[PDB]
Symmetry: D2
Subunit: 128 residues, 4 copies
């Protein structure tokens, strides 16, 4: 239902993603989480194009082990907390078996033009 792994994306880190001390910069993690989230929403008939859509209100990451080039990583994604307009999404970042990072993003649905929160769509509601 809700807190199950609903999306798994595997990909490779670019060497230029690393900063001057030789590991992937922290913002790139949020880029990764971004692509995984967007891909899953793509799976769910939810688009960035429409008049109304999701916006990140909060996002966070816990770094347990550093990632160095080259590395093949897997992201396991689950959605946990649904408000009326808000939702929480979790991203687990693995290198091989080893778990490298923890992402948590609070996303809100809004009318982009009117920058006001709008309630959450039914298709995610169906994950109960």
């Amino acid at each position: 239902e809700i807190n199950k792994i609903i999306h798994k994306k595997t990909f490779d880190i670019a060497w230029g993603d690393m900063d001057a001390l030789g590991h992937v910069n922290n913002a790139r993690y949020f880029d990764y989480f971004q692509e995984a989230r967007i891909d899953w929403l793509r799976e769910l008939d939810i688009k960035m194009t429409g008049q109304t859509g999701p916006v990140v209100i909060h996002v966070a990451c816990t770094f347990l082990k550093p990632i160095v080039y080259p590395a093949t990583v897997t992201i396991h994604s689950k959605v946990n907390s649904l408000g009326n307009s808000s939702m929480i999404m979790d991203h687990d970042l693995y290198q091989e078996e080893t778990l490298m990072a923890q992402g948590v993003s609070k996303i809100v649905w809004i009318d982009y033009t009117q920058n006001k929160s709008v309630p959450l769509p039914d298709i995610i509601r169906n994950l109960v």
Copy 2:
């Protein structure tokens, strides 16, 4: 001394920082916080080069109002709670009088080569 404003960075957003939705992409915020912080460490005569240095162990941001090109934004940074190896830095990012975001970063001091926790610099200790 501690939760006092210890760094203030004012700058203009780059157009290329915006995503396909016509406002600044979320990771770019973490770039901003990262550079403000690094400038402050520079202010404490701390540079990223030495045998010992800061490592982000946690980072988070709350986005209150969207940012569009062009915009002049200010980051106000304070250090709030100090451990032996860890510290937290808070960032308020305003466009003019309005608050766009609030960032929280937990940083740990380590020996980079050995990947081990190391105590906080004394120059950081002076803010108590």
Copy 3:
């Protein structure tokens, strides 16, 4: 005839301790977009510029910290096209030289339009 000065971000560097080369194109792009915005040419509108060619010469590597200056000029005016130069100096040293050929087209219509006269005034 235009100079944008700024400070290098530490995160612009790659794992080899120098500003990444693509980041230069980000810099030049920002200088160009800035200068066009100053002349009230905006990225928002239905019609706008599209870069068809861009190039950079790397003379000296840039390391954090560095305060750099970009000097942007349009050297050659076509009818629909233009050539713009962005030279990146760190104080007395010239660090990089970028050259971009730019044409104006309609994003919606995917079609050519002649040059504005105000750009002709950058001569």
Copy 4:
């Protein structure tokens, strides 16, 4: 060398296409990968340094897109070399990068 990959949505700028610098990121990554295959790493004291780089934009790339980069050594100087990265979407050539590299 042939590197195929997929475009990230965040690679796009506010105009709905891949930002121009990211192409140089792509080319650079293809180069580094080929070097990795030939057991050449930037870690060592000796390595290639790009002195010139250029790109011609022929057709815009929109998300999603599966792109193939074909990279070859074009011209060998004594210290210099020219390297080409042609970026194709399927059969269509989308961009062409040319970089002059020395050691």
